[PDB]
Write a protein that binds this DNA or RNA. Structure first.
Lengths: 234, 94, 65, 86, 77
RNA sequence: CAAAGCCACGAUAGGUCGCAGUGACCAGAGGGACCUGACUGUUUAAUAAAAACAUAGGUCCCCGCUAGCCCGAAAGGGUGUG
RNA sequence: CCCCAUGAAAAGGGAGUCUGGAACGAUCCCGGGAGACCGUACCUAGAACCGACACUGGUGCCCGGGUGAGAAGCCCAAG
């Protein structure tokens, strides 16, 4: 019948874009080629980020934004490049790091801007050294590999204890995603009419089919437990 | 260290408050000045800059105004200390 | 129970108790790492703190300096 | 230190960067100085002590002498154009 | 023309010897002009909804007098 | 401060009328036992407001960005100023 | 004081600093000259709009006394 709610987000309409003009800017590492020293000038909040950011002036006169790192302040100076030491907030490369180092916002390939450990509360740990690259573990206890000259920042991104405070109120939940393109509030499907949901319909609300399906399952039908390794509370 | 200081407060003349000592120090009429680590950096250089203009010994205090004031005994902190009379203590050589 | 009740008798005490304990730590008087605990610091937003003496903005946790 | 005959700058005021020579110490918080032949030739005017910043050059002058001798005293040291090099 | 914000809702009856009462609209206030690096509340510069062509009166005689105080400025000279 | 003129508010005494003194007007009936839904909220315009939906929370699944997710013919699009 | 919501951007103005230029020369006052084109009537709704109508439907928006907390009810000002 009429396509799924997940299907609707595939159109790329208004209901799914972000008002990033209300956001400070694209916070990825600006491209540098050597070693340079910068000072923090401001910290601002960025709505759909769940983590504070920093405005930092460059010694050569550049403006850029990076996720804010714990224990760093306005007016403190940050050096970036090969020569920089292991200090909180300094941006260095993995080639100089020792084992078990705590860093965040690790860059994948040179000049990309960092794609891992950029949210609040997380950190990056080093689990070894490869032949050409470095062993890095994210909070999900998995491992990724990034280049030698790939950049990173020593410290931890601010936002610890983020979810301890209960929402306590759907109003909070409503204004948590007021800017993020998450469709809110989420609506379950099992109570929906069958005309627009694979498990819709039926007076007695029940699971129509075993939710687990084969890997070759067509799009728009994969629902519920998708490629589950195991179920149960334990 | 503290025994040396505690003697000065007992009898030796002391100055409390940056404005007075900074007013006074530029005229080169202070025996010595001790500053805790908590001084606003805007003034620390000026003290250090003014330190060499009449060669007045300066001791850097790792503490804050509190422990400096707690030793000073005043309930409120002292950022700096001004001295115009060592009295009987043995601090100036430091 | 003080601040735990400022919403009346709603949402469940167990929820309230959890919201209770964390909240005081925000309002429990802290120690400014830069000037000193002399003045008190405030949490404008998660990670945002400065007392009214140091005038030193810095990165904090979600609810603690 | 703040001493007589030491060339020095002023933090503020119209000159706010021009120099004057210390002639006397009228009190613990004011001293009279004069940049005699600056580009503006600031007239003999005392100033607050928190209003100056000493330099690293000093000239020997008696107690509060006049313009003629500083006109010569500094050029005796040959620091005529170094008013700004001060 | 529809009830708007462009004009403070004033009237006229204090300083007034004739007999007639009405309404007037007048645009909002300014402040000391815009940008931000030292975020310091400035002073000593004139900013009226008209400009009297007063040259210096709107700017201090200090070196950076119209620019900002000496809190965040010794990075240039 | 305190006096004077004003002005508002809050109490005291005394007398006195009527059936009636928040005189009209304006203006909760209340109590007890039980079931269901946690609640404020939302919706069947023009037969239905509810126990129907969302909720705060617990719980599981997928995934290390050239990911995952989904849309088109294709350029690619959007979750991504992440 | 609140925020896991942090609450738009341009043009348009004004100022500051450094370079070059000519010596005349105004962000001063005084006298003089000019300043396209186009909107401009009326009605805002129990008769001026729509709902087929001179329609108790909707579409608006904003603003005296006493009694009285009151923009509640009543009555009476302006009309």
């Amino acid at each position: 019948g009429k396509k799924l709610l997940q299907q609707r987000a595939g159109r790329g309409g208004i209901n799914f874009r972000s008002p990033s003009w209300r956001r400070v800017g694209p916070a990825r590492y600006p491209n540098i080629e050597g070693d340079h020293k910068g000072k923090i000038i401001d910290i601002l909040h960025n709505p759909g980020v769940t983590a504070p950011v920093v405005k930092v002036k460059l010694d050569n006169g550049l403006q850029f934004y990076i996720p804010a790192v714990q224990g760093v302040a306005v007016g403190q100076e940050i050096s970036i490049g090969k020569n920089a030491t292991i200090s909180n907030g300094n941006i260095v490369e993995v080639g100089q790091l020792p084992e078990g180092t705590v860093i965040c916002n690790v860059e994948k390939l040179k000049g990309d801007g960092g794609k891992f450990a950029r949210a609040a509360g997380s950190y990056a740990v080093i689990s070894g050294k490869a032949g050409n690259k470095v062993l890095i573990k994210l909070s999900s206890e998995k491992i990724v590999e990034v280049s030698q000259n790939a950049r990173a920042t020593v410290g931890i991104i601010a936002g610890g204890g983020f979810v301890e405070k209960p929402l306590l109120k759907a109003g909070n939940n409503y204004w948590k995603y007021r800017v993020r393109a998450v469709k809110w509030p989420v609506v379950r499907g099992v109570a929906m009419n069958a005309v627009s949901h694979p498990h819709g319909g039926g007076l007695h609300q029940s699971v129509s089919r075993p939710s687990t399906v084969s890997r070759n399952a067509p799009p728009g039908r994969k629902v519920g437990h998708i490629a589950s390794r195991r179920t149960g509370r334990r | 260290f503290e025994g040396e200081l505690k003697t000065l407060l007992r009898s030796g003349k002391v100055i409390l408050g940056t404005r007075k000592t900074l007013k006074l120090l530029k005229t080169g009429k202070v025996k010595g000045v001790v500053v805790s680590s908590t001084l606003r950096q805007d003034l620390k250089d000026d003290i250090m800059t003014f330190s060499k203009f009449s060669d007045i010994p300066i001791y850097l205090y790792k503490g804050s105004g509190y422990e400096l004031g707690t030793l000073c005994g005043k309930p409120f902190m002292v950022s700096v200390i001004g001295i115009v009379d060592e009295g009987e203590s043995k601090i100036l050589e430091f | 129970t003080g601040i735990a009740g400022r919403f009346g008798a709603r949402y469940g005490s167990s929820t309230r108790k959890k919201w209770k304990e964390v909240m005081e730590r925000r309002y429990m008087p802290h120690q400014c790492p830069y000037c000193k605990t002399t003045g008190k610091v405030v949490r404008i937003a998660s990670g945002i703190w400065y007392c009214r003496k140091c005038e030193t903005k810095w990165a904090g946790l979600a609810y603690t300096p | 230190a703040i001493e007589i005959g030491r060339i020095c700058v002023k933090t503020r005021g119209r000159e706010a960067g021009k120099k004057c020579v210390i002639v006397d110490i009228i009190d613990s918080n004011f001293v009279l100085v004069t940049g005699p032949k600056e580009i503006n030739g600031v007239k003999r005017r005392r100033v607050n002590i928190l209003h100056i910043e000493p330099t690293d050059k000093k000239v020997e002058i008696n107690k509060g002498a006049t313009d003629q001798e500083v006109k010569q005293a500094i050029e005796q040291s040959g620091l005529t154009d170094f008013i700004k090099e001060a | 023309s529809p009830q708007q914000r462009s004009g403070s809702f004033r009237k006229v009856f204090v300083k007034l010897p004739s007999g007639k009462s009405t309404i007037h609209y007048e645009r909002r206030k300014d402040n000391i002009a815009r940008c931000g690096m030292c975020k310091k509340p400035l002073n000593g510069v004139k900013n009226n909804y008209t400009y009297k062509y007063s040259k210096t009166e709107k700017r201090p005689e200090r070196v950076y007098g119209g620019y900002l105080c000496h809190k965040c400025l010794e990075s240039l000279i």
